[PDB]
Amino acid sequence: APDKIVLDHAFGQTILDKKPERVATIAWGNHDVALALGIVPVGFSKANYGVSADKGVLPWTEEKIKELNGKANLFDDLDGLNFEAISNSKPDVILAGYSGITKEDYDTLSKIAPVAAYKSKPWQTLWRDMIKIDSKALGMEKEGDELIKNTEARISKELEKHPEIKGKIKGKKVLFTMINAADTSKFWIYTSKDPRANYLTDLGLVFPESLKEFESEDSFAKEISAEEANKINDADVIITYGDDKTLEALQKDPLLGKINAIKNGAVAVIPDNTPLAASCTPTPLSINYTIEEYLNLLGNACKNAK
Ligand SMILES: [Cl-]
Ligand SMILES: [Cl-]
């Protein structure tokens, strides 16, 4: 101020004339940026992964809302953007820095309020950039930077607190994947532009050279054939969502069982549909809530590497 706020994103530019008071957010995580900055959204998207849709809000989010003496104002939008609900919240801005909105979505949303969209591609926003984009739209760029620094300090503290884990995982080559043990003919590898993959580097892990082959500006994950399985023998550890049958199934799999990380038992299985699984695409609030338990799980997997 007196400068307007000018946001550049995938769909052009958004201009705000002053700092927005009523904040709506959509899609994953963005509400946690507002909340970590001390603001209770006038509405935000419902969740049903790691929480029942009946509650509709993840535990770290609910806890911050209660600290701020607010309440959860949820858009009934599990089946897609609910434009009427958003419009009824009377927002001054819509935060969508990590999201999958289309141009049609963007145009419809912009009729309601200024929209902070992602920079280039849907679902390709790392956690620090989600904070940068979302906090700029709030006119709180400096506070967003302070939040990033504080979140980085939390990560560092948790690592220093458990030196054996930090030492075990440091420099280990990792891939975050989605593998369905019931059909291993194809599986997914999350790319370096996906926040759940890059978060692993914040913890001291690194990507293997094999990831570069699968990289593509066009998406946040690549579908890999079992025929290509051998390419990822350079991973020391693999992460996948799964359950209590996943590791055993993969080790007995006649297509993937020979892959080094799998053969060695160096597989971090993130229990499906839990708050921990939800937290793997991190937000400032989820990190503090889950980092000890995530590092413990990753550390235990890395013990089996080699
Ligand atoms: Cl979402
Ligand atoms: Cl606060």
Short mmCIF file of C-alpha atoms and ligand atoms in Angstrom, two decimals, residues 26-29 45-46 98-100 123, ligand 1:
data_model
loop_
_atom_site.label_atom_id
_atom_site.label_comp_id
_atom_site.label_asym_id
_atom_site.label_seq_id
_atom_site.Cartn_x
_atom_site.Cartn_y
_atom_site.Cartn_z
CA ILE A 26 -10.26 -23.90 -2.48
CA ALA A 27 -8.49 -27.21 -3.07
CA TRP A 28 -5.90 -28.88 -0.90
CA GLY A 29 -3.79 -27.10 1.68
CA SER A 45 -12.77 -26.99 0.61
CA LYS A 46 -14.00 -30.13 2.34
CA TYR A 98 -1.98 -25.25 -5.04
CA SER A 99 -4.96 -26.45 -7.08
CA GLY A 100 -6.10 -28.04 -10.32
CA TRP A 123 -1.13 -29.49 -8.94
CL CL B 1 -8.39 -30.91 -3.31
#
